[PDB]
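Dataset card, provenance and construction

Sequences and ligand SMILES were collected as paired inputs. For each pair, a complete structure of the chain with the small molecule in place was predicted and serialized as structure tokens. The example below shows a pair involving pyridoxal-5'-phosphate. Curators did not alter the output after generation; any descriptive sentences attached to a record were derived from the structure itself.
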Amino acid sequence: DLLSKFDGLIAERQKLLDSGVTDPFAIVMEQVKSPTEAVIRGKDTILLGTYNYMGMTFDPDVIAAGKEALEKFGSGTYGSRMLNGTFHDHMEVEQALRDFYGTTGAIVFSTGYMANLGIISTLAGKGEYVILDADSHASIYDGCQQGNAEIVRFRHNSVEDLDKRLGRLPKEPAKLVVLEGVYSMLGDIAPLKEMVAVAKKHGAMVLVDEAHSMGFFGPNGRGVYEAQGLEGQIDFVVGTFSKSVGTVGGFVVSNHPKFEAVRLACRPYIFTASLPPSVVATATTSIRKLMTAHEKRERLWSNARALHGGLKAMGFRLGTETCDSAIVAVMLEDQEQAAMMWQALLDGGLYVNMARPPATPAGTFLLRCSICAEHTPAQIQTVLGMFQAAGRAVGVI
Amino acid sequence: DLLSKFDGLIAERQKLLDSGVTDPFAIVMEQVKSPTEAVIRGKDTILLGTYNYMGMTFDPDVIAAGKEALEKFGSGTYGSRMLNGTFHDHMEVEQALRDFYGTTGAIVFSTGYMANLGIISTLAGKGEYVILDADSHASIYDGCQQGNAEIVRFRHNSVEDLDKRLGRLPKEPAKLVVLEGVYSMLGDIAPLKEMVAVAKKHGAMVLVDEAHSMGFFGPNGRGVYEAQGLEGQIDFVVGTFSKSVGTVGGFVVSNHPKFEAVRLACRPYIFTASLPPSVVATATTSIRKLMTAHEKRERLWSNARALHGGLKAMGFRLGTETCDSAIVAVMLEDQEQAAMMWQALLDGGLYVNMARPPATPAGTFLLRCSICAEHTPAQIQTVLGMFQAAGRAVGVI
Ligand SMILES: *Cc1c(COP(=O)(O)O)cnc(C)c1O
Ligand SMILES: *Cc1c(COP(=O)(O)O)cnc(C)c1O
């Protein structure tokens, strides 16, 4: 029947479960103390495998705004904004995004995934081109699949191949180059300055996903593009509320004068219910605080550099030579070593992300650490000690 | 550039704005009293254009659970359930859905739109068939577009054409018939009993969307399929939290023994952040209450029948001969009459949905009333009086 196609996935998964102890795909946090600590399998555990970059999820203003919105506006919404009306909160979160990014346009979506799906599939039509890195996020590929444009992959992280591939396309049709500021697998950064120069040379529009940079790259925290001096050169910036902001949602911002027309045409925007009052309230409050969260940003980067430098010094192989983002990736030799290391860390009171094939390329086995602004220096030292102990015990270092 | 393709939509929209007064695509509820009343354009307004069927959005247990979840678990989540872990609330809402539908399987998604997008595109692969009503919801069509299956439209509401179209397909490949219980445009009901018999005759699996029926069709409130005696014959049921439950989210339930494999393959499930604690808490609490919300169900249907019967008696042309759902559709003669009627109602203190081409078929111009369990009999009488007054003033009756 229709599920026979999954027999292979089912068998593969079971083999993988049988070879390990804890199922990394079924981690549950049973109680929570903070953005950095929860109980997992009955043990107080430092959280280092989650995307709460700015530790906004327990911010007292964020929480208060969510509670108040529940009280005053209820648990849900009337339906589609366009068809059934909305609370004023939606206009307010879009204004907050305009203010955050310094743009004339902002459109909020129910998720970051849907923001990418919708914007890519709506902007590029039949006969047009979407040009993207070979290792682009799934949501970006899914937007290409949802649309009717031509797809043009370029070799991962290659300015030269972007240039060559773009230059070989027909000149007249409109083109969307889609880039990510941070490559999330290893935590390295895209050469956006150089790539955007290439895109503009070929007359393409540029969309940059800044999901992994919000509040901590660039003078205003707008992202890698801002840090690299590209203010005013990026046609569209897509992001999410689910990493730095601290709730669900997606958005696209732009200065394009016709940007509002996207609401008229974008099916994933039109055909879904608007976000609940509590969600919009937490997002708006968080976004406004992120504009000036200098202390959080400071701690986030200090913590990231401490962890990166500390692990490097211990002899771990990292995904990056320098600490370039809030993701620190430890590279292991094989599937078993990665699982044993991950398990040792978990058993000792540390949760990190494990990434293995086919989620990563064959031959790449990672422990990915995502730093939080609310990690303390002591916690980062504890983490380093836990890595040292597990790494020695397993034989990684 | 990439937005030149919207020049037509932009011009059309502006012409439509110029011909009316209030923009029906930018309705804002500035303050809220209840599920049935808000301030719109400074006026106390009865809400009859929203999808809050069971009035759960201000239920005191629902609100309390949302507030408590914010306090205890914060505003957001760790990321993807599969990759970054989750709170136990996600397993709990899936259990609530298993209990609600009496199924062995339940998978929650970030939206109903994504549940349809994901399940359709994941279940039916290359060489397989998705068979759907010509007037299917956009999310169902978008799932077809996201997937690589063959698409097979059948004539709207035609058991005979479903049968004929199915019978003419190659026999061996697996097939998904996708049906909606309630046709939301006019508020009529699908002949699911007859259509499911046809699907099974041809060996197809059946997916039914029960977004417009949850808590008020069938002995257990499971949907039109339950009401029509199809318990145990439906392979998959898809729904949303955004109508009856009172928050955002989608789900699919099933008794298929391999249903869990969908998590391994379904990209819109994998590549998005899990729903926030407050959202999951409000959903779980609401779903559990909906299992036994007999009083709400009673009022909802009483209100629907009162409105339908009352409008019919006044001489309005309705989309249905009998009151078959909680959507009552008033059919108007032309674009202008619909707008004038809608505007008169709004100005007088009643908000209903207006649906016109190209959202409806050319020649169909609707005012759609969506009833709430928390409407009072007095409010429904007030609504009838408002329709009578506006209809006379505009010339509809
Ligand atoms: C996180 C992320 C997403 C998904 O955002 P959600 O809000 O979790 O749906 C999509 N694309 C990119 C590049 C991301 O980083
Ligand atoms: C309401 C509805 C949807 C959308 O659900 P959201 O949760 O608002 O995304 C999708 N399909 C059908 C048939 C619906 O009725």
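Derived descriptions for this record:
Chain B touches chain A through 99 residues (CB under 8 Å).
Chain B is about 40% helix and 20% strand.
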